[PDB]
Amino acid sequence: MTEYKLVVVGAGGVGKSALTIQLIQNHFVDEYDPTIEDSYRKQVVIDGETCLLDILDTAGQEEYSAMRDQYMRTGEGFLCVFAINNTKSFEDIHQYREQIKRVKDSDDVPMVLVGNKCDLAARTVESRQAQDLARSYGIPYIETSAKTRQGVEDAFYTLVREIRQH
Amino acid sequence: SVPTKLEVVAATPTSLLISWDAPAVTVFFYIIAYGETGHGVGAFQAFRVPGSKSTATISGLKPGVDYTITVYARGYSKQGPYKPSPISINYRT
Ligand SMILES: Nc1nc2c(ncn2[C@@H]2O[C@H](COP(=O)(O)OP(=O)(O)OP(O)(O)=S)[C@@H](O)[C@H]2O)c(=O)[nH]1
Ligand SMILES: [Mg+2]
């Protein structure tokens, strides 16, 4: 059975753990428990093809170079997550991508840009800015709510499709 | 709770300099979280600082607004993951 090693990366508090737990266990974690490192494995069927998702839920960036370099080397695809109420989380995306490209030695890495917390009223990052960034990288952009499940399955399955089509 | 003695040491209408007492164990990193007092789930911002720090600046705040600030310590020990309960304070402006 094919395995996909997915790595969720982004600033602290943007919803990486809540998005992962919604995909894998189908419930919303409302408590904030900052992550050190967590792995999730689940057998799924995507577009009729059975696979195992091995998802690494990482501590918030910026991580120590030595640790970040290890999961960027082994990751096959990256969910780059910001929160639409955190402009710093959005601005930091560019350097996360540059670091993944440097470790992979490739400008073509399977990646999806995720704008999370799209259920919140008071947004500080516009969709237009994020769509323009994702287009500049040639990668998909999707807005998600771990709370309502809007876009969650689409974001992870889109990342698996990016790996399969690489 | 870890760390201890969380306080605002300097404030402007848009910024807070916060300070805390490090525990007597090695901390890998801290998370600083801030939002309006009584905010709904997810309605906050957070950033990571290295475990060597015992201060942080929070910027881009609205003048005359009540904020809740929370600090989490994270790391490892002989016992396993180090995930103590956070410490919080409230501060206006
Ligand atoms: N309203 C809302 N809240 C969310 C959403 N996603 C996550 N949250 C909330 O924000 C908080 C942080 O989410 P979490 O998944 O723990 O962040 P994280 O990115 O894993 O944080 P870290 O481990 O890097 S420090 C939690 O209280 C969670 O319930 C969302 O889509 N909408
Ligand atoms: Mg987490």
Residue numbers in the entry:
A (entry chain E): 1 to 166
B (entry chain F): 3 to 95
Task: Cite, word for word, the article reporting this structure.
Activating mutations in the RAS genes are frequently present in human tumors, and these RAS mutants play important roles in oncogenic transformation. Here, we report a monobody, termed 12VC1, that recognizes the active state of both KRAS(G12V) and KRAS(G12C) up to 400-times more tightly than wild-type KRAS. When expressed as a genetically encoded reagent, it potently inhibited RAS-mediated signaling in HEK293 cells overexpressing EGFP-KRAS(G12V) and -KRAS(G12C) but not EGFP-KRAS(G12D).
A comparison of the 12VC1–HRAS(G12C) structure with the structure of 12VC1 bound to HRAS(WT) would allow us to conclusively differentiate the two possibility. However, we did not obtain crystals of the 12VC1–HRAS(WT) complex, probably due to its low-affinity interaction. Thus, we improved the affinity of 12VC1 to the wild type by mutating the residues that formed the pocket that “sensed” G12C (V33, A48, and K50) and by incorporating the T35A mutation that improved the overall affinity to RAS. The resulting clone, termed 12VC3, had improved affinity to wild-type RAS, although it still retained 90-fold selectivity to G12C, and enabled us to determine the crystal structure of its complex with HRAS(WT) at 1.98 Å resolution. Overlay of the two structures and molecular dynamics (MD) simulations revealed that there are no significant differences in the backbone conformation between HRAS(WT) and HRAS(G12C) captured by the respective monobodies. Similar degrees of differences in side-chain orientations were also observed in other crystal structures of HRAS(WT), thus eliminating side-chain orientation as a main energetic contributor to the high selectivity of 12VC1 for the RAS mutants. Taken together, these findings demonstrate that RAS mutations at position 12 can be selectively recognized in a noncovalent manner by a small pocket within a binding protein and potentially other types of molecules.
